[PDB]
Amino acid sequence: DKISHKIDIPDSAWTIGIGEKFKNAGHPNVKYPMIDDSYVQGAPLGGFGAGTIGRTYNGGFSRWHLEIGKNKYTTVYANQFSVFQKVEGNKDGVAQVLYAGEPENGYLSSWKWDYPKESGMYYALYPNSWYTYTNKDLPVQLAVKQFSPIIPYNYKETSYPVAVFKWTAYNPTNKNVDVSIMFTWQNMIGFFGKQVNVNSGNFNKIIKDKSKDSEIVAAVMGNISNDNEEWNGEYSIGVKKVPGVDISYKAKFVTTGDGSDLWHEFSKNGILDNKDDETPTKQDGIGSAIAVNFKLQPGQTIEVPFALSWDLPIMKFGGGDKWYKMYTKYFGKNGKNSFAILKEALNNYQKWEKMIDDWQKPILSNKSKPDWYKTALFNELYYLADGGTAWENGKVGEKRTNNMFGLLECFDYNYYETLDVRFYGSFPLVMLWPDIEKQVMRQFADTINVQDSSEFKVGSNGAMAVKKVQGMIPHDLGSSYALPWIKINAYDWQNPNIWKDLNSKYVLLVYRDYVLTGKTDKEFLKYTWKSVKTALDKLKEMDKDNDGIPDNEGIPDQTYDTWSMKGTSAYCGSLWLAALKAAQEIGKVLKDNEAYIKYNEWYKIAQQNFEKELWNGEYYNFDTESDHKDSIMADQLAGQWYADILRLGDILPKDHVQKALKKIYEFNVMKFENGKMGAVNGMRPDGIVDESDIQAQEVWTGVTYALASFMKYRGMTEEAYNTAYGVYKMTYDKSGKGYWFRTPEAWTKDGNYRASMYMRPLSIWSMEV
Ligand SMILES: OC[C@H]1CNC[C@@H](O)[C@@H]1O
Numbered sequence: 127d128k129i130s131h132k133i134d135i136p137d138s139a140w141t142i143g144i145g146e147k148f149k150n151a152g153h154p155n156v157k158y159p160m161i162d163d164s165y166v167q168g169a170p171l172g173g174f175g176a177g178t179i180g181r182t183y184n185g186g187f188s189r190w191h192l193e194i195g196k197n198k199y200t201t202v203y204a205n206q207f208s209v210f211q212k213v214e215g216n217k218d219g220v221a222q223v224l225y226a227g228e229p230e231n232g233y234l235s236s237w238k239w240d241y242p243k244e245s246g247m248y249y250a251l252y253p254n255s256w257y258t259y260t261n262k263d264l265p266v267q268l269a270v271k272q273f274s275p276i277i278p279y280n281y282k283e284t285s286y287p288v289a290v291f292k293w294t295a296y297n298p299t300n301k302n303v304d305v306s307i308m309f310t311w312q313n314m315i316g317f318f319g320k321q322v323n324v325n326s327g328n329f330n331k332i333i334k335d336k337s338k339d340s341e342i343v344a345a346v347m348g349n350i351s352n353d354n355e356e357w358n359g360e361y362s363i364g365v366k367k368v369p370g371v372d373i374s375y376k377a378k379f380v381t382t383g384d385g386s387d388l389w390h391e392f393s394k395n396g397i398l399d400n401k402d403d404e405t406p407t408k409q410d411g412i413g414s415a416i417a418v419n420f421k422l423q424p425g426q427t428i429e430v431p432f433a434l435s436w437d438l439p440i441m442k443f444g445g446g447d448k449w450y451k452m453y454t455k456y457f458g459k460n461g462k463n464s465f466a467i468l469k470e471a472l473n474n475y476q477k478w479e480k481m482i483d484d485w486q487k488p489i490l491s492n493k494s495k496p497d498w499y500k501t502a503l504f505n506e507l508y509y510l511a512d513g514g515t516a517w518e519n520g521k522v523g524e525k526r527t528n529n530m531f532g533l534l535e536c537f538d539y540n541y542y543e544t545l546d547v548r549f550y551g552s553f554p555l556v557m558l559w560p561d562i563e564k565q566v567m568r569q570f571a572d573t574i575n576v577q578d579s580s581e582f583k584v585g586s587n588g589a590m591a592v593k594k595v596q597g598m599i600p601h602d603l604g605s606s607y608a609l610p611w612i613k614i615n616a617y618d619w620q621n622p623n624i625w626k627d628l629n630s631k632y633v634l635l636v637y638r639d640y641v642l643t644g645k646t647d648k649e650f651l652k653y654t655w656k657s658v659k660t661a662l663d664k665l666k667e668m669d670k671d672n673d674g675i676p677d678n679e680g681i682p683d684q685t686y687d688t689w690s691m692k693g694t695s696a697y698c699g700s701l702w703l704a705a706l707k708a709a710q711e712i713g714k715v716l717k718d719n720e721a722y723i724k725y726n727e728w729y730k731i732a733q734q735n736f737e738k739e740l741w742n743g744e745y746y747n748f749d750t751e752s753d754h755k756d757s758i759m760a761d762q763l764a765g766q767w768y769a770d771i772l773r774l775g776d777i778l779p780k781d782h783v784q785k786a787l788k789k790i791y792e793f794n795v796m797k798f799e800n801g802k803m804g805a806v807n808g809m810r811p812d813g814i815v816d817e818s819d820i821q822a823q824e825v826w827t828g829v830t831y832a833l834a835s836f837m838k839y840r841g842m843t844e845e846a847y848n849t850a851y852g853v854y855k856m857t858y859d860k861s862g863k864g865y866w867f868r869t870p871e872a873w874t875k876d877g878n879y880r881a882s883m884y885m886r887p888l889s890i891w892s893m894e895v
C-alpha cells in the first residue's frame with residue numbers, strides 16, 4: 127500500500143477490506159418480516175431530499191433510496207468502475223471490474239468480475255468515503271475519494287442529487303504503465319415507478335462541453351418522453367479532462383446482454399470506440415461508459431475527477447401526491463437537467479471538499495477525543511440523507527415561502543418525523559441545519575388544533591379511536607405509502623392522542639430550538655407559543671388523581687410503545703416537569719405573565735409530588751403503579767437531560783440526579799454484558815434485566831447515546847464514553863454485529879436487532895452540545 131501516502135484519509139475513518147466476509151452479523155429478532163439487507167453496506171451518496179444511492183464497501187451500487195421513502199437493495203451490476211493496466215513493453219494488459227463479486231445471471235459475463243480479496247480497503251467518514259486498490263496484478267496503485275456536498279448551514283449544495291469520484295493514480299514501479307479507468311452506468315429510467323415496458327424509449331447521448339481549459343465529456347441517459355412523472359428524468363456520468371489524460375466513451379452498450387460490445391474494446395487497450403448512438407431501446411436495458419486513459423511514468427501521480435448525477439425531479443407517495451424535490455429550485459423541474467448538475471460538480475468539487483474539511487476539522491483536530499467517537503459521530507449522519515428524506519419544492523400542479531421537510535423514523539415503521547423519536551434524533555438538524563429543524567417544528571405547530579373525527583383500529587387492542595384530537599400533538603406527519611405532511615398520524619399500533627410524552631416533548635423541542643440557535647429567534651417562539659400553551663393545558667387534563675402530573679394509563683402511552691407505565695412515571699413525569707419549566711421561560715421571554723405564573727404553580731406542585739412519589743434513596747422508580755415499579759430505567763431522567771441542554775437548571779436535586787446516573791451506569795450498563803453493548807432499558811434492583819416486556823430487555827441506541835450525553839454534562843466523563851463505546855462497538859467494530867450505515871433502534875443481549883436504519887441514534891450529536 128503505497129497509495130495511502132498519496133491521499134489524505136483521516137485516522138478515524140471506519141475501515142474494512144474490499145471483499146471481506148464478516149462472520150458475526152446480527153439479524154432481526156422479531157416475529158414479522160423485517161428488513162435485513164446484510165452487512166454489505168457503505169456510506170450513501172446524494173443530498174437531502176434527492177434520493178440516495180448506497181455504494182457498498184464491495185464496490186456495487188446496491189442500496190437504492192431513489193424512490194423517496196422506500197429501501198430497495200439490489201446490485202445494478204452494470205454500474206461500476208473498471209481498470210485496465212499495461213506495463214510498457216508487455217504484449218497484453220489486464221482489465222478488471224472493481225467489484226468484489228459477480229452477477230447472479232449471465233448478463234455481462236464477458237466482463238472480468240470478482241475483484242480479489244486482500245487487495246484493497248474501503249474507508250468512511252461521512253460524507254466522504256474512499257477505496258484503495260493494492261493488487262499484485264495492478265502495478266499502478268489507485269484510490270478514489272467519493273462524496274456528495276453535505277455541508278452544515280448550507281441548504282443548496284446539500285440538496286444536490288450528485289456524487290464526485292476523485293481518483294488518484296500512482297506508479298511506484300520502475301516502468302511506464304498505461305492506465306485506464308472506466309465508469310459504466312445503466313440507463314436506469316424505469317427502474318422504479320413504471321408499470322409496464324420498463325426500458326421503452328430509454329436513450330443515451332454524449333455531451334462534450336469544451337469551455338477553454340475545461341473539457342467535460344458526459345453521458346446523459348434519459349427517455350424520449352417529455353412526460354412529467356416520478357419515473358422520468360435523466361442520469362448522467364462524466365469526467366473532466368486534466369493534463370496528461372485522454373477521454374474515450376461509448377454511448378450505448380446493452381446491459382441485458384453479455385457486455386462484450388463494451389468489454390472487447392476496454393480489455394484490448396483501455397480505449398473505447400467513441401461511438402455515439404441515440405437510438406432508443408425497446409426491451410433491452412442500455413448503459414453508457416466514460417473512460418480516461420493515460421501513461422504514468424515511474425514515480426508519477428495523477429488526479430482525475432468523475433461524477434454521477436440523477437435528475438428525477440418528482441417524488442410520488444402512495445396516497446397519490448406528487449411533489450418536486452428541493453434541488454429543483456436550483457436546476458429546474460423538467461427532468462432534463464442532469465448534465466447541468468454534473469457540470470456544476472465537476473467544476474466545483476475542490477471547493478466542496480474544502481467546505482467539508484472546514485466543518486469536520488473542529489472535531490477531527492480535537493485531540494482530547496478518541497478516534498472511535500469521531501468515527502461514530504460523523505458516520506451516524508449517514509441517516510440524514512439515507513432516511514427516506516423528503517424535501518419539497520412545490521406540489522406538482524400547484525408557490526409558498528417554505529419547503530416542507532421530513533425524515534423517516536425508519537423504513538420498517540414508515541412514518542415521517544415521529545416526534546417521540548425526533549426528540550432524540552433531531553440533534554444534527556438543530557445543530558447543523560437549523561432552518562430545516564425550525565421548519566419541521568412549525569409543521570408540528572400547525573397540526574396542534576387539527577381535529578379528524580374519522581376512526582381507526584388501534585393495533586395493540588383492536589379498539590376503535592379518533593384519528594386526531596384537537597390540542598394533542600401528532601405522533602408523525604404521515605407515511606410515504608400515504609400522504610406525507612397531509613395525512614398525519616399514520617402510526618396506529620397505539621393511539622397517540624392519549625400519549626403522555628408527545629405534548630411535553632413538543633414543548634421541549636420548541637425551547638431547545640430557541641436555545642441552541644443562540645436565544646435570538648423570538649419570532650419562532652411567537653409562532654409556536656399558542657401551540658405550546660395548548661399542548662401543556664391538554665396534558666394537565668390527563669392528571670386523574672390531582673398530584674399535578676399526567677397519569678400513565680397502564681398501557682404503553684409513550685415512545686416505549688409496548689412497555690406499560692401506570693401512574694406517575696419517571697420518564698413522562700420528568701419530561702412534564704422540564705416542559706413546564708421551559709414554558710415558564712418562554713412566558714418570561716414573551717412577557718406573558720399569566721402563563722409564567724400558571725406554569726410556575728403547576729411546576730412547583732408537580733416537582734414536589736414527583737420527588738415524593740419516585741425518589742427511593744438510590745434512584746427514581748420506574749413508576750408508581752406497575753408490577754415492576756422499582757425497575758431502574760435507563761431513561762428515567764429524560765426531562766433533566768433536556769433541562770441541562772436547555773439551561774433550565776435543576777428540576778431535581780443535583781445529589782439525586784448524580785446518584786441515579788451512577789446507579790444506571792452500575793446496573794443498566796455494567797451488569798449488561800459487562801458494559802460492552804450500551805444501556806439496557808430496564809433492570810431490576812437485584813441486577814437482573816426486567817422481563818415485563820421486550821423493550822425493557824433491549825438496548826436502544828439513541829437512548830444510550832443520549833444517556834452518554836447526560837452523563838457527560840454531569841461530569842461523569844468516563845461513564846459517558848464507556849456507555850457510548852458499547853454502541854460504537856456493536857455498530858462498527860469487528861467484534862460487533864455489523865450494523866454500519868444501518869444503525870438500528872435496538873438490540874437484545876444476543877446482539878440481534880430491531881429496526882435497522884433508525885432515526886434515534888442521531889442523538890449521538892447531543893454529546894457535542
Ligand atoms: O421502537 C419503538 C418505536 C416504534 N415505532 C413508533 C415509535 O413511536 C416508537 O418509539
Ligand SMILES: [Ca+2]
Pocket residue numbers: 495496497498
Ligand atoms: Ca484513539
Ligand SMILES: [Ca+2]
Pocket residue numbers: 668669670671672673674675676677693694
Ligand atoms: Ca397524576
